[PDB]
Amino acid sequence: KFYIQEPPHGSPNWLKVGLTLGTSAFLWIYLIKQHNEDVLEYKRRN
Amino acid sequence: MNPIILIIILMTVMLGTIIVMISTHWLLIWIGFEMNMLAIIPIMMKKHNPRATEASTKYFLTQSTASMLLMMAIIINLMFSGQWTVMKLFNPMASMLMTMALAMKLGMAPFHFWVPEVTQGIPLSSGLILLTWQKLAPMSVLYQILPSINLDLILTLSILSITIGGWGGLNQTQLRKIMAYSSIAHMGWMTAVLLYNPTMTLLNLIIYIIMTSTMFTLFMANSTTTTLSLSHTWNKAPIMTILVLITLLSMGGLPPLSGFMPKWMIIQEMTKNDSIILPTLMAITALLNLYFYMRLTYSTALTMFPSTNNMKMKWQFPTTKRMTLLPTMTVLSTMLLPLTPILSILE
């Protein structure tokens, strides 16, 4: 439809978006874990 | 130009500056400087022309004799008090020669005559990586041996580099000599705080490196050497216009934008001493290094110059280049006014 000889993209890859969302969900999980540890650490030392 | 080979050579640039960062033996600092020079030669001369040849020649002579002057300084240090510790020196003579060797290295106003030349002919990746590493690495050593420097040297070279970088910038209608004189101006403001509180100097260093990274990325996006090409990049792409606007205005250092967080904090931790007339003369010349930014942005977007056709032809083909990292460094460089208590991240 309507193109000539090349989509350089347009049908997006199924590698990079899955990898970036996977590591970004990993980073959100780890930061929530960090902040919970920090609240526990403050109320532990005091 | 195998990419294995270029990854090797830039890894040696990495290794040279890491050796300069890591070591307390003076020979290792001198070796790191030399290795940085050795690897930074063939990043240039990827061209064939004698432009790159003679520019690398000038760079070689100036940078090599500055390194040998540094070795002279370390030798007079050990004719005096015998230690290989990077610490307070024990000679005004050796500190004089050492600061002048670093002054030839990173460029001061009596010593900058290789800088517009060496940026005049080289390609843009070469200029980017030499400006970033070759202006980061001597400032580490200056931070290391700050408490034993005769103040007249640093201060006079700083004032003179600011006023020469302001004065010479008014004429050059290329891009790279404008960028070189801007480098001189920022190195003047980086050196000028070194005897008072060096956290400001290293913050000035990081923000200047981010500004230059954005600048050279926005000159890699378009093969530009004069303002005429900048007018054609007005007529080919709209977002480049306002990005050149905001980045050149932050090169000027205006308060709502984020080129002001260096200057203002420097004036703070400068005028908490009783030097006032000299910082306000510095800041008036820092007003003066801004008119060539203004005529540049005038030529880019604030006016509309006539463009040649075949931009009709260029409209079909998008700017599908590589960018190093354009937007992240851009908005980290431009919207970072209210995070001034992220001064103390650096210390």
């Binding site: 978006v17 970036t20 969302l21 970004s24 980073l27 959100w28 930061l31 960090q34 902040h35 920090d38 609240v39 650490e41 403050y42 030392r45 005091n46 | 956290t199 977002i239 998008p318 700017t319 960018m323 354009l326 937007p327 992240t328 851009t330 908005v331 980290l332 919207m335 209210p338 995070l339 208590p341 992220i342 103390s344 991240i345 210390e347």
Partner: protein, 119 residues
Amino acid sequence: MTGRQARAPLQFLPDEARSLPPPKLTDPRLAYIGFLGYCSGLIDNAIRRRPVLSAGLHRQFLYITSFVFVGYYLLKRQDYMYAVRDHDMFSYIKSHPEDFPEKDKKTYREVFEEFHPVR
């Protein structure tokens, strides 16, 4: 200033950074960081000639996550540096009594001022 844990220089947060409160949820500075990540992703979609607020929503998520994570560690460093500065200051205050004299802050019934009016 100079460390004051100039022993582990790369120690980005020491054991002494476990005593002050961590940066809370929806603090205004980390909110501004997330806003900058949102604007960063907007202008990144503006670069590559792709539609704004469209087809880069995963990049919106990634940029916002990256900046919020970085700014989280930066805020923790900020709080540690200002806490150790305040503690060192107060130790040097308590250390020397006689060198920091408390003036007799007298009241204004006898503290004279020259006036020099305007007419």
